Write a protein that holds these residues in place. Structure first.
Motif, PDB file in Angstrom:
ATOM      1  N   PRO A 143     -51.517 -19.485  89.867  1.00  0.00           N
ATOM      2  CA  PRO A 143     -51.047 -19.244  88.503  1.00  0.00           C
ATOM      3  C   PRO A 143     -51.493 -20.382  87.591  1.00  0.00           C
ATOM      4  CG  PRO A 143     -49.284 -20.120  89.807  1.00  0.00           C
ATOM      5  CD  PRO A 143     -50.388 -19.764  90.772  1.00  0.00           C
ATOM      6  N   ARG A 144     -52.036 -20.028  86.431  1.00  0.00           N
ATOM      7  CA  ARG A 144     -52.492 -21.019  85.475  1.00  0.00           C
ATOM      8  C   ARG A 144     -52.056 -20.595  84.084  1.00  0.00           C
ATOM      9  NH1 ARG A 144     -52.986 -23.655  89.348  1.00  0.00           N
ATOM     10  NH2 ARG A 144     -54.893 -24.383  90.394  1.00  0.00           N
ATOM     11  N   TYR A 145     -51.626 -21.560  83.279  1.00  0.00           N
ATOM     12  CA  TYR A 145     -51.201 -21.253  81.926  1.00  0.00           C
ATOM     13  C   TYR A 145     -52.409 -21.503  81.032  1.00  0.00           C
ATOM     14  CZ  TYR A 145     -48.325 -20.687  77.847  1.00  0.00           C
ATOM     15  OH  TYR A 145     -47.799 -20.190  76.679  1.00  0.00           O
ATOM     16  N   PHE A 146     -52.939 -20.433  80.446  1.00  0.00           N
ATOM     17  CA  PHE A 146     -54.121 -20.528  79.594  1.00  0.00           C
ATOM     18  C   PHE A 146     -53.874 -20.382  78.106  1.00  0.00           C
ATOM     19  CE2 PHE A 146     -58.242 -20.829  81.737  1.00  0.00           C
ATOM     20  CZ  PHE A 146     -57.852 -20.784  83.076  1.00  0.00           C
ATOM     21  N   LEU A 147     -54.738 -21.030  77.333  1.00  0.00           N
ATOM     22  CA  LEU A 147     -54.681 -20.975  75.886  1.00  0.00           C
ATOM     23  C   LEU A 147     -56.075 -20.669  75.375  1.00  0.00           C
ATOM     24  CD1 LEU A 147     -52.959 -23.993  76.651  1.00  0.00           C
ATOM     25  CD2 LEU A 147     -51.949 -22.992  74.592  1.00  0.00           C
ATOM     26  N   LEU A 148     -56.184 -19.614  74.577  1.00  0.00           N
ATOM     27  CA  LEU A 148     -57.460 -19.217  73.992  1.00  0.00           C
ATOM     28  C   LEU A 148     -57.407 -19.594  72.519  1.00  0.00           C
ATOM     29  CD1 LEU A 148     -60.149 -17.545  73.922  1.00  0.00           C
ATOM     30  CD2 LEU A 148     -58.703 -15.568  73.373  1.00  0.00           C
ATOM     31  N   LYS A 149     -58.382 -20.374  72.063  1.00  0.00           N
ATOM     32  CA  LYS A 149     -58.437 -20.789  70.662  1.00  0.00           C
ATOM     33  C   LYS A 149     -59.540 -20.015  69.951  1.00  0.00           C
ATOM     34  CE  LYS A 149     -56.771 -25.472  71.557  1.00  0.00           C
ATOM     35  NZ  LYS A 149     -56.404 -25.146  72.961  1.00  0.00           N
ATOM     36  N   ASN A 150     -59.449 -19.901  68.627  1.00  0.00           N
ATOM     37  CA  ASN A 150     -60.453 -19.133  67.902  1.00  0.00           C
ATOM     38  C   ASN A 150     -61.830 -19.787  67.805  1.00  0.00           C
ATOM     39  OD1 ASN A 150     -60.871 -16.621  66.439  1.00  0.00           O
ATOM     40  ND2 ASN A 150     -61.126 -17.895  64.609  1.00  0.00           N
ATOM     41  N   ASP A 151     -61.974 -20.999  68.333  1.00  0.00           N
ATOM     42  CA  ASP A 151     -63.278 -21.662  68.315  1.00  0.00           C
ATOM     43  C   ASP A 151     -63.986 -21.382  69.644  1.00  0.00           C
ATOM     44  OD1 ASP A 151     -61.837 -23.242  70.096  1.00  0.00           O
ATOM     45  OD2 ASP A 151     -62.589 -25.138  69.307  1.00  0.00           O
ATOM     46  N   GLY A 152     -63.330 -20.603  70.500  1.00  0.00           N
ATOM     47  CA  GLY A 152     -63.910 -20.257  71.788  1.00  0.00           C
ATOM     48  C   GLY A 152     -63.329 -21.020  72.962  1.00  0.00           C
ATOM     49  N   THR A 153     -62.562 -22.062  72.664  1.00  0.00           N
ATOM     50  CA  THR A 153     -61.950 -22.874  73.704  1.00  0.00           C
ATOM     51  C   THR A 153     -60.996 -22.066  74.579  1.00  0.00           C
ATOM     52  OG1 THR A 153     -62.043 -24.885  72.344  1.00  0.00           O
ATOM     53  CG2 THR A 153     -60.497 -24.878  74.192  1.00  0.00           C
ATOM     54  N   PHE A 154     -61.197 -22.125  75.890  1.00  0.00           N
ATOM     55  CA  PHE A 154     -60.313 -21.435  76.825  1.00  0.00           C
ATOM     56  C   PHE A 154     -59.944 -22.512  77.841  1.00  0.00           C
ATOM     57  CE2 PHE A 154     -59.584 -17.674  79.885  1.00  0.00           C
ATOM     58  CZ  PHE A 154     -58.403 -17.316  79.243  1.00  0.00           C
ATOM     59  N   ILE A 155     -58.702 -22.972  77.763  1.00  0.00           N
ATOM     60  CA  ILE A 155     -58.226 -24.053  78.611  1.00  0.00           C
ATOM     61  C   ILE A 155     -57.012 -23.643  79.449  1.00  0.00           C
ATOM     62  CG2 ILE A 155     -56.724 -24.938  76.793  1.00  0.00           C
ATOM     63  CD1 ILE A 155     -57.471 -27.760  77.743  1.00  0.00           C
ATOM     64  N   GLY A 156     -57.045 -23.978  80.736  1.00  0.00           N
ATOM     65  CA  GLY A 156     -55.955 -23.616  81.627  1.00  0.00           C
ATOM     66  C   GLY A 156     -55.305 -24.799  82.313  1.00  0.00           C
ATOM     67  N   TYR A 157     -53.980 -24.744  82.413  1.00  0.00           N
ATOM     68  CA  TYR A 157     -53.190 -25.807  83.025  1.00  0.00           C
ATOM     69  C   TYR A 157     -52.346 -25.325  84.198  1.00  0.00           C
ATOM     70  CZ  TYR A 157     -54.074 -28.140  78.509  1.00  0.00           C
ATOM     71  OH  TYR A 157     -54.632 -28.708  77.392  1.00  0.00           O
ATOM     72  N   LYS A 158     -51.990 -26.262  85.068  1.00  0.00           N
ATOM     73  CA  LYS A 158     -51.159 -25.968  86.225  1.00  0.00           C
ATOM     74  C   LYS A 158     -49.766 -25.628  85.707  1.00  0.00           C
ATOM     75  CE  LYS A 158     -49.614 -28.067  90.584  1.00  0.00           C
ATOM     76  NZ  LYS A 158     -48.198 -27.653  90.380  1.00  0.00           N
ATOM     77  N   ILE A 210     -60.079 -12.125  73.940  1.00  0.00           N
ATOM     78  CA  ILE A 210     -61.279 -12.888  74.269  1.00  0.00           C
ATOM     79  C   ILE A 210     -62.522 -12.296  73.596  1.00  0.00           C
ATOM     80  CG2 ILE A 210     -62.825 -13.615  76.114  1.00  0.00           C
ATOM     81  CD1 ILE A 210     -60.286 -13.531  77.972  1.00  0.00           C
ATOM     82  N   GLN A 211     -62.662 -10.976  73.657  1.00  0.00           N
ATOM     83  CA  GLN A 211     -63.813 -10.318  73.058  1.00  0.00           C
ATOM     84  C   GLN A 211     -63.849 -10.533  71.544  1.00  0.00           C
ATOM     85  OE1 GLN A 211     -67.052  -9.435  73.287  1.00  0.00           O
ATOM     86  NE2 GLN A 211     -66.443  -8.093  74.979  1.00  0.00           N
ATOM     87  N   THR A 212     -62.682 -10.525  70.906  1.00  0.00           N
ATOM     88  CA  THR A 212     -62.626 -10.711  69.462  1.00  0.00           C
ATOM     89  C   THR A 212     -63.089 -12.112  69.087  1.00  0.00           C
ATOM     90  OG1 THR A 212     -60.842  -9.100  69.188  1.00  0.00           O
ATOM     91  CG2 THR A 212     -61.149 -10.719  67.419  1.00  0.00           C
ATOM     92  N   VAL A 213     -62.653 -13.104  69.854  1.00  0.00           N
ATOM     93  CA  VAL A 213     -63.046 -14.482  69.597  1.00  0.00           C
ATOM     94  C   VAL A 213     -64.549 -14.641  69.814  1.00  0.00           C
ATOM     95  CG1 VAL A 213     -62.831 -16.868  70.372  1.00  0.00           C
ATOM     96  CG2 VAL A 213     -60.785 -15.432  70.156  1.00  0.00           C
ATOM     97  N   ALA A 214     -65.050 -14.085  70.912  1.00  0.00           N
ATOM     98  CA  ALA A 214     -66.469 -14.181  71.216  1.00  0.00           C
ATOM     99  C   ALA A 214     -67.296 -13.505  70.126  1.00  0.00           C
ATOM    100  CB  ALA A 214     -66.759 -13.551  72.577  1.00  0.00           C
ATOM    101  N   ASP A 215     -66.853 -12.333  69.681  1.00  0.00           N
ATOM    102  CA  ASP A 215     -67.577 -11.606  68.644  1.00  0.00           C
ATOM    103  C   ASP A 215     -67.619 -12.398  67.346  1.00  0.00           C
ATOM    104  OD1 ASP A 215     -68.009  -9.606  70.427  1.00  0.00           O
ATOM    105  OD2 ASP A 215     -66.581  -8.189  69.543  1.00  0.00           O
TER     106      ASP A 215
END
Length: 119
Positions: free
Chosen positions: A22-37, A101-106
């Protein structure tokens, strides 16, 4: 003007140990996708993330094996192929994440085209 688009728990498959954690993830509108324990804390002391990668220029794939409701983020970075695999309990949740994710990437692809086209 970077902001969090979506955040929540995801079951992430390891890159080396193909087990799921299990990982807690945060998706930012600049494309950053970061996951924490663990869900992040409000201090400069907060532990570093275990996962940190941009979804810009990446491709989203959906699969049902070995786990249903699995989604994969694939990025072709130079000669290296990055693949990050996640699982959520319901198909609705997967759609929630893949759409975000697709919206941010687009959005980022749009910016790229505006910079690279007819220069």
């Amino acid at each position: 003007d970077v902001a969090i688009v979506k955040e929540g728990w995801l079951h992430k498959r390891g890159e080396y140990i193909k087990t799921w954690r299990p990982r807690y993830f945060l998706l930012k509108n600049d494309g950053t996708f970061i996951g924490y324990k663990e869900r992040p804390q409000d201090v400069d002391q907060r532990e570093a993330p275990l996962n940190n990668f941009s979804v810009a220029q990446c491709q989203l794939m959906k699969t049902e094996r070995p786990r249903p409701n699995t989604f994969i983020i694939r990025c072709l970075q130079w000669t290296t192929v990055i693949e990050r695999t996640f699982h959520v309990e319901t198909p609705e949740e997967r759609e929630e994440w893949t759409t975000a994710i697709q919206t941010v990437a687009d959005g980022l692809k749009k910016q790229e085209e505006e910079e690279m086209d007819f220069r």
